[PDB]
Amino acid sequence: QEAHRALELLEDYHARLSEPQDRALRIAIERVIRIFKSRLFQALLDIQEFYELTLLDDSKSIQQKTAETLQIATKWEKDGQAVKIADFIK
Amino acid sequence: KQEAHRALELLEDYHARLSEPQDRALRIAIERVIRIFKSRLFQALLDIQEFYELTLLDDSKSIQQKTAETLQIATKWEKDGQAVKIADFIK
Ligand SMILES: [Cl-]
Numbered sequence: 273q274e275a276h277r278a279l280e281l282l283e284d285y286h287a288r289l290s291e292p293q294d295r296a297l298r299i300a301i302e303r304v305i306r307i308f309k310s311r312l313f314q315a316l317l318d319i320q321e322f323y324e325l326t327l328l329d330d331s332k333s334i335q336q337k338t339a340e341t342l343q344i345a346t347k348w349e350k351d352g353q354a355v356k357i358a359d360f361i362k
Numbered sequence: 363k364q365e366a367h368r369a370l371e372l373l374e375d376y377h378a379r380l381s382e383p384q385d386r387a388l389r390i391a392i393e394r395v396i397r398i399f400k401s402r403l404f405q406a407l408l409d410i411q412e413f414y415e416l417t418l419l420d421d422s423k424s425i426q427q428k429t430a431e432t433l434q435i436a437t438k439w440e441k442d443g444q445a446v447k448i449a450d451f452i453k
C-alpha cells in the first residue's frame with residue numbers, strides 16, 4: 273500500500289478485468305479513474321491560480337504576497353478537515 | 363506556460379529561489395502551502411487505496427456489490443463541487 277502508487281495499482285486492476293461478466297465493474301472503474309484525474313487537475317489549478325494571482329504579480333510587495341500566502345494556507349487547512357453534510361442539485 | 367501538471371514543480375522552484383533574508387517570511391509561508399497541498403494529494407491517493415483494498419480486493423463481495431460501491435465513490439466525488447462542507451464541525 274504505497275500511496276503514490278495507488279492510482280497505478282487501480283489502473284493495473286482495470287487492465288486485468290477482461291471477462292464479459294466483469295465489464296460493468298470495468299466501466300465503473302474507468303469512471304472512478306476519470307473523476308479522480310479531474311480532482312487532481314482541479315487541485316493543481318488551485319496552485320496555478322495562487323501562483324499567478326499572488327506570486328507572479330511583481331506589483332505586490334513581499335508583505336502582501338506573504339499575507340495572501342498565509343490566507344491560502346489557512347483556507348486550505350480548513351478545507352482539509354471540512355465534513356460534507358449535503359449536496360445541492362445544479 | 364501554465365501546464366497544470368507542473369504547478370507544484372513551479373511553486374517548489376519559486377520557493378527554492380527565495381533566498382534573501384527579507385523574503386524569508388514569504389519562503390516559510392510558501393513551504394506551509396506546499397506541505398498542506400501535498401497532504402491534500404496524499405489523502406486523495408489514500409481515498410483510492412482505501413477503495414482498492416476494501417472494495418476491489420475483498421473476494422467476499424460480489425461483482426454487483428463491487429460495481430455499486432465503485433459507482434458510489436465516483437458519484438460522491440462528482441458531487442463535491444456542489445457540496446456543503448463544514449469546517450470544524452460538531453461531533
Ligand atoms: Cl482534493
Ligand SMILES: [K+]
Nearest residue numbers: 315351402442
Ligand atoms: K478536495
